[PDB]
Enzyme design. Structure first.
Site, PDB file in Angstrom:
ATOM      1  N   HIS A 126       6.410  97.470 -45.106  1.00  0.00           N
ATOM      2  CA  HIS A 126       7.784  97.405 -44.747  1.00  0.00           C
ATOM      3  C   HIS A 126       8.632  97.677 -45.900  1.00  0.00           C
ATOM      4  CE1 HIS A 126      10.903  95.305 -42.068  1.00  0.00           C
ATOM      5  NE2 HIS A 126      11.233  96.587 -42.398  1.00  0.00           N
ATOM      6  N   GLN A 129      12.624  96.894 -46.223  1.00  0.00           N
ATOM      7  CA  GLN A 129      13.009  95.527 -46.413  1.00  0.00           C
ATOM      8  C   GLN A 129      13.001  95.212 -47.878  1.00  0.00           C
ATOM      9  OE1 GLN A 129      14.000  92.992 -44.171  1.00  0.00           O
ATOM     10  NE2 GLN A 129      14.509  92.138 -46.175  1.00  0.00           N
ATOM     11  N   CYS A 254      13.732  87.137 -44.899  1.00  0.00           N
ATOM     12  CA  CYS A 254      14.080  88.422 -44.233  1.00  0.00           C
ATOM     13  C   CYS A 254      14.612  88.199 -42.826  1.00  0.00           C
ATOM     14  CB  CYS A 254      12.885  89.365 -44.170  1.00  0.00           C
ATOM     15  SG  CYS A 254      11.444  88.480 -43.604  1.00  0.00           S
ATOM     16  N   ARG A 282      20.425  95.372 -46.040  1.00  0.00           N
ATOM     17  CA  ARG A 282      19.578  96.293 -45.310  1.00  0.00           C
ATOM     18  C   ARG A 282      20.304  97.582 -45.082  1.00  0.00           C
ATOM     19  NH1 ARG A 282      15.179  94.829 -42.173  1.00  0.00           N
ATOM     20  NH2 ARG A 282      14.875  97.020 -41.484  1.00  0.00           N
TER      21      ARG A 282
END
Lengths: 297, 297, 297
Positions: A126, A129, A254, A282
């Site tokens: 990911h 992130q 997150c 983000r």
């Protein structure tokens, strides 16, 4: 605008970026965040592909494009192979963000696609992130030299991406996970190898007090259940555990969170938390990434 | 452009608007309808959330944003709670229009959301419709003082919203519904209370001839079945019933219609009908609403 | 920009266009392809309706609108009748592209709609494809007078659309299909009737060597299975069959393809192939079409 040149078409794990590349990105994200929305991607289009629909990712991406004068195109994973579909997108479009489960699939789409491909999230990785997380940290410290991030929890994809991310920028990171739930050898391994060149100290272990010790940042995330729960109970972030970090640590997550599971409300809603700032970034990190990738024309 | 200041973040039932606020909105909708599409919401984004997908609403909203230089983001009700999702939207976006069944849910989303929330339609309420309807009437009369609207049919959400709407602007409204199908006490009650301050005469009863008497406007809408049908047959709008209204009445219906059920074709397709004008004004009313809400930054 | 005037609101089969109209379209598509994206459809909106979701079509359309300064609105075929929905779209929107299975349905939507309707693809017809194909050919030849296109394969909707397309522009076309799989009498018939006025030579038969003979272009497409497969095996495009065409033929395919079925890789990936150029032109042909239709205001 001083746009960063990336020497890569795609962004899949974080590892196809040089360290300089990553800062440039971060520094750019910040500039964009400060500066009134430029139409830097006039009429460009980002395809958005989903395995299971995920709001946070989808919206942050679509938003970004829209704010950059572009457009996001929501596609579904109700599909001809993921080769055929890559070929097609390329004719009519400018880039693709995919979230799917199998990372191998993404790799494939990238090879076969002739336009940029961005990993929205696979089971293993990911990137986006982690990249928003680094941005957040850097907003605070203005530097990674000499900084410790502790991640405690499950050895999951965001963990992986943090490892690689930290290794790349020479940020030290220790991970504490329960006995079963260490992250993947193959990644730890890559991460360690990157670190050899950036002097970042990476470590994986079990006792969380050790991970959090003298940490500048603490990071957790959410976790048949009867026996698992009892095993992670000690890996909770709380008044008690956070005392072993620096006085001046900040908390990351997150999201979303289950309070009184991974984290006590005291912590997550306390002034040490910066989960919100995190959340926002983000948008901006991604914007920065998108623009750089799209100017490799 | 002379944009209206609303002293509210959200719009859920109609009742969070002052009377002046409602006119200002209407008057603005009309000005917008006349005037070549201004990009008044450059780059703003409206999230669109659906319980069951509804075309008329979705399109009229998306259209509006697009015409205002914005973007509509179609989300689904295949979802983490409707709290978590509100929090998120707010970071990346500018407003939310939700249609869902339970109004309580919408209320919740609004409290928790830090950006404007607009009720697309809940089971109990349908503000946006009523607001387009008032616009339509005002287009004709240029005033609500002294005007009677009859609604006959089922005591449904659009009924509710009309009650509140009429009460707010001092328009008189009588409702005729069959014995089982009166609208909600709690609403009638609120409506009556608003009316005490605007001099609007609101009433609920059963004989439709009474509702339509000396009405300036007539409004119906669509309606196990074997026994129900036979009960509403008398509540049909037709040559016969409409004679008791003013010569110069106009017919409204929110659509779609089943001709030779609630309304005979003679009426709905006759020159007294203005269902089409009505239909269009959805777009514009909403536009007006959207712009006002979005400039509360 | 020198935009073409079409004397038709809709485009369903190809047959509502004059021959001149079709060239003008083609010539315009080409000009657009060359020229930096004009915002010729500022703020216009195209509804996109789907029976089964189809990527290639959806993306090429949405893209086009976006590049023309418009917006594409993805709707679903999870729907009130396809009459009611036409009426509605017209109020809030500028045009509709539908793909559904039953062509009759599309016809209906067009009659009832008061805005342009474009057949994305029905079972019987696929105009937009054919139109991109003609564009492609014309890019090569700069003329249809005296040109032979062979189509071999199943007598499918793209076949139909090619017949009509070729007939309209006076391009000769022969079709070879196996015994069961001829295209529809009714179409062949219409096509033949158009051809009487353009001098195009149209023919349908079985031996493919005959179809491909002295052809300037060859076109195939994909094809219980055990017995069918053995029947089409001879209708494969390959080194062997293509020798009977002109030395200087080019290969077309609407994609996607199954290599070593309808076409050998040698051919499709060979220099005679122009399937890619074809693929791209979907975008542009459509753009040209869209713009002409939308300026019939």
């Amino acid at each position: 605008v001083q746009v960063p040149k990336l020497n890569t078409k795609d962004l899949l794990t974080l590892e196809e970026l040089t360290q300089e590349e990553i800062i440039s990105l971060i520094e750019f994200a910040i500039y964009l965040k400060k500066n009134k929305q430029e139409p830097l991607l006039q009429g460009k289009i980002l395809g958005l592909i989903f395995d299971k629909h995920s709001t946070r990712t989808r919206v942050s991406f679509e938003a970004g494009m829209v704010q950059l004068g572009g457009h996001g195109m929501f596609l579904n994973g109700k599909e001809e192979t993921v080769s055929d579909t890559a070929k097609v997108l390329s004719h009519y479009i400018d880039g693709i963000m995919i979230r799917t489960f199998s990372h191998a699939d993404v790799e494939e789409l990238a090879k076969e696609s002739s336009i940029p491909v961005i990993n929205g999230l696979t089971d293993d990785h990911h990137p986006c992130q982690a990249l928003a997380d680094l941005m957040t940290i850097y907003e605070e410290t203005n530097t990674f030299k000499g900084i410790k991030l502790a991640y405690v929890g499950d050895g999951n994809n965001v963990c992986h991406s943090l490892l690689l991310a930290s290794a790349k920028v020479g940020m030290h990171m220790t991970v504490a996970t329960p006995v079963g739930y260490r992250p993947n050898e193959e990644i730890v391994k890559k991460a360690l190898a990157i670190a050899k060149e950036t002097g970042a100290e990476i470590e994986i272990l079990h006792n969380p007090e050790l991970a959090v010790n003298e940490a500048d940042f603490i990071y957790t995330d959410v976790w048949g259940e009867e026996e698992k729960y009892t095993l992670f109970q000690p890996y909770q972030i709380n008044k008690e555990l956070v005392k072993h970090a620096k006085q001046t640590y900040h908390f990351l997550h997150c999201l979303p969170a289950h309070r009184e599971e991974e984290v006590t409300g005291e912590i997550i809603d306390g002034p040490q938390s910066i989960v919100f700032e995190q959340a926002g970034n983000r948008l901006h990190a991604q914007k920065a990434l998108l623009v750089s990738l799209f100017k490799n024309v």
